[PDB]
């Protein structure tokens, strides 16, 4: 977890994500489940 956050997109090798996110196939990236996921700036 020390080096590059364990390559994790969010929480840390065992990665995980915040509510409203699913951990990706690669087991590192996080995929949002809804149009307005937490902690993302909104676009039109």
């Amino acid at each position: 977890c020390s080096l590059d956050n364990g390559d994790c997109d969010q929480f840390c090798v065992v990665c995980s994500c915040a509510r409203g996110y699913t951990l990706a196939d690669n087991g590192k990236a996080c995929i949002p489940t809804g149009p307005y996921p937490c902690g993302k700036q909104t676009l039109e």
Binding site: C1, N5, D9, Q10, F11, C12, A18, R19, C30, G34, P35, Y36, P37, C38, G39, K40, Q41, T42, L43, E44
Partner: protein, 234 residues
């Protein structure tokens, strides 16, 4: 906010504004979910009755996306006191759920150990709000944001007239004229990790605003992640 800049469309969607009986903003909040707003305990003392406005970027103009919510339940930390300003945290449950849209979306809550090790050790965070633009001046009618560096705890304690507790952290600038101010209190301090913003602080207090040799003091949200979780489950 002293210094900083107006938030661009969608840039600060987790911002909430507590409005008093005179329909005037007096404190900020952070959207945590469709039902919960995070704010400072000390804000609750400033208005007998208040509502929450989301989606507003300019308090002088009604623009699309603004909505008003009544508060159903106020959950103030039982250890907050004005003597020390320690435990300066509250959660508001709203009567009706917020509809997420452009300019209206929650900030992420992090996990405690990860946040302590990875978020808080970042260089900077972002503070936002509609508070005073100068210490002795008027509140901003436009939503402003400001990047504020994390400041070393010991440096901050040396600078402060008051005790800095483990439930607080410091951020901002020694002498540069940029800081949060009164009226921003209760609002969000967020830290970006990669492309996600996580709530790391609640705008709490400071001696004046943007004073040379003083910093802004924030409630350290990591200290209260269990408390928040318990508050949001009732």
């Amino acid at each position: 906010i002293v210094g900083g800049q107006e938030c661009k469309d969608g840039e600060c969607p987790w911002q909430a504004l507590l409005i008093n009986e005179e329909n005037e903003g007096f404190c900020g909040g952070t959207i945590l979910s469709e039902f919960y707003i995070l704010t400072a305990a000390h804000c609750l003392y400033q208005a007998k009755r208040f509502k929450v406005r989301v989606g507003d970027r300019n308090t002088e103009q009604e623009e699309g996306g603004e909505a008003v919510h009544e508060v159903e339940v106020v959950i103030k930390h039982n250890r907050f006191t004005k003597e020390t300003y320690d435990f300066d945290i509250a959660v508001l449950r709203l009567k009706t759920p917020i509809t997420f849209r452009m300019n209206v979306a929650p900030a992420c809550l992090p996990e405690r150990d990860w946040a302590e090790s990875t978020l808080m050790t970042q260089k900077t965070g972002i503070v936002s709000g509609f508070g005073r633009t100068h210490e002795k001046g008027r509140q901003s009618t436009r939503l402003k944001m400001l990047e504020v560096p994390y400041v070393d705890r010991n440096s901050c304690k040396l600078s402060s007239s008051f005790i800095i507790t483990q439930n607080m952290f410091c951020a901002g600038y020694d002498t540069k004229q940029e800081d949060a101010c009164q009226g921003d209190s209760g609002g969000p301090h967020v830290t970006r990790f990669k492309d996600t913003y996580f709530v790391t602080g609640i705008v709490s207090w400071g001696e004046g605003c943007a004073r040379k040799g003083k910093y802004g003091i924030y409630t350290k949200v990591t200290a209260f992640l269990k408390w928040i979780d318990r508050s949001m489950k009732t």
